[PDB]
């Protein structure tokens, strides 16, 4: 099986030069928080290279922000380890209790255990002092990701296979891109008001950056996989399905470009200026780099 022709018109924003530092800080943070990874979990984490993904997405961030973002991703991989191939990933009853505890700690509940203490420390470092608008959007994307493990478990227990569109709308909340877009507002020094978040072209742009990451992750990992759902929808071969997914990924990258053009038009038509225009134009500038940075991580 070969990787298909990728239509990547977006230029690279570079790789953060503090990649080795943020990897050392991440593992030292894990040891400080008492996150005793097992031998299979450690080998997976080293192989996964979370410092490479976080350095390609935020190549211009401060070393402090890079460390905090990388520890969010480090912690998220440990969450995925215990809810996708763990004892709680099968039983929806244990999955419901375990996810509900995390979203409670994320809302300020008293932590219990190494994983909950790490989430509480990550939350207080990231959320304390930021606007209610940012926290409301950040909790929504983070809670939706945590609850997708419960949705996959219940859908698995019910023998229900996801739809084509419902999987793409599940994949948005289950991918890492949506919480990253919230962390991007931190490092870029912007804060979007609810009016800007309600712009049609910005919503289409944010979803396109998210859709591209989710499909690109599934292509580079060909269950609840987009390439597998394409092979089943068409009865094709694995190579034909992968090549078909590469075409859909090209249509998503085109959706990024059209959403960027329409977002500029909506800015000038709505009379947006001041800090809000700087924030939206900053997204038009950076979101191409997020797509390329996420692409270079998965594909390479």
Ligand X SMILES: CC(C)=CCC/C(C)=C/CC/C(C)=C(\F)COP(=O)(O)OP(=O)(O)O
Please give the residues from 84 up to 103 whose contact with Mg ion meets the rule CB under 5 A: 84
Collapsed DSSP state (helix, strand, coil) of residue 28 = helix
CB of 261 to ligand X, least distance (A): 28
CB of 28 to ligand X, least distance (A): 19
21's CB contacts (< 8 A; 6+ apart) are 63, 66, 67
Collapsed DSSP state (helix, strand, coil) of residue 221 = coil
DSSP state of 191: -
Q: Please give the size of the binding site for ligand X, defined by CB under 6 A.
A: 16
Using CB under 5 A as the binding rule, whether residue 81 contacts Mg ion is answered as no
255's CB contacts (< 8 A; 6+ apart) are 204, 208, 211
Query: Which residue in the set 181, 183, 227, 252 belongs to the binding site for ligand X (CB under 6 A)?
Result: 183
Query: Which residue in the set 22, 174, 207, 210 belongs to the binding site for ligand X (CB under 6 A)?
Result: 174
Whole-angstrom distance, CA of residue 272 vs CA of residue 292 = 28
Using CB under 6 A as the binding rule, whether residue 73 contacts ligand X is answered as yes
Stretch that binds ligand X, among 8-16, 34-42, 77-85, 255-263 (CB under 6 A): 77-85
Nearest to residue 152, comparing CAs of 165, 143, 162?
A: 162
Please give the residues from 249 up to 288 whose contact with Mg ion meets the rule CB under 5 A: none
Whole-angstrom distance, CA of residue 30 vs CA of residue 118 = 8
CB of 221 to ligand X, least distance (A): 6
Nearest to residue 277, comparing CAs of 296, 264, 288?
A: 264
CA dist 236 to 16, 141, 151, 218, 263, Å? 40, 34, 28, 17, 38
DSSP state of 111: P
- Return the CA Rg of the chain: 19
Please give the residues from 101 up to 160 whose contact with ligand X meets the rule CB under 6 A: 142, 145
When the beta carbons of 72 and 202 are compared against ligand X, the nearer one is 72
Using CB under 5 A as the binding rule, whether residue 80 contacts Mg ion is answered as yes
Query: Which residue in the set 52, 76, 186, 216 belongs to the binding site for ligand X (CB under 6 A)?
Result: 76
CB of 153 to ligand X, least distance (A): 14
Contact positions vs ligand X (CB under 6 A): 72-73, 76-77, 80, 84, 142, 145, 174-176, 179, 183, 217-218, 221
Interface residues toward Mg ion, by CB under 5 A: 80, 84
């Amino acid at each position: 099986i070969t990787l298909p022709a990728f239509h990547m018109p977006f230029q690279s924003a570079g790789c953060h030069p503090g990649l080795a530092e943020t990897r050392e800080a991440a593992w030292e943070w894990a040891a400080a928080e008492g996150l005793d990874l097992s031998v299979p979990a450690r080998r997976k984490m080293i192989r996964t290279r979370p410092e490479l993904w976080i350095s390609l997405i935020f190549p211009q961030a401060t070393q402090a922000h890079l460390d905090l973002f990388c520890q969010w991703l480090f912690w998220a991989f440990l969450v995925d380890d215990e809810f996708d191939d763990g004892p709680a990933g099968r039983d929806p009853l244990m999955c419901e209790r375990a996810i509900a505890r995390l979203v409670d700690v994320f809302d300020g509940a008293a932590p219990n255990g190494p994983m909950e203490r790490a989430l509480a420390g990550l939350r207080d470092r990231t959320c304390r002092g930021r606007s209610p608008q940012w926290n409301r959007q950040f909790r929504r994307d983070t809670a939706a990701w945590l609850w997708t493990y419960y949705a996959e478990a219940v859908e698995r227990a019910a023998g229900q296979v996801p739809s084509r569109a419902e999987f793409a709308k599940h994949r948005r909340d289950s991918v890492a891109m949506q919480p990253f877009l919230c962390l991007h507002e931190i490092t870029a020094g912007i804060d979007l008001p609810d009016s800007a978040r309600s712009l049609p072209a910005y919503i289409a742009l944010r979803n396109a950056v998210t859709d591209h990451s989710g499909l690109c992750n599934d292509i580079c990992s060909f269950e609840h996989n987009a390439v597998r759902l394409i092979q089943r929808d068409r009865g094709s071969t694995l190579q034909e399905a992968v090549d078909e997914a590469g075409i859909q990924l090209a249509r998503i990258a085109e959706r990024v470009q059209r959403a960027e053009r329409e977002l500029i038009e909506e800015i000038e038509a709505a009379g947006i200026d001041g800090p809000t225009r700087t924030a939206l134009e900053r997204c038009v500038r950076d979101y191409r780099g997020l797509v390329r940075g996420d692409f270079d991580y998965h594909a390479r």
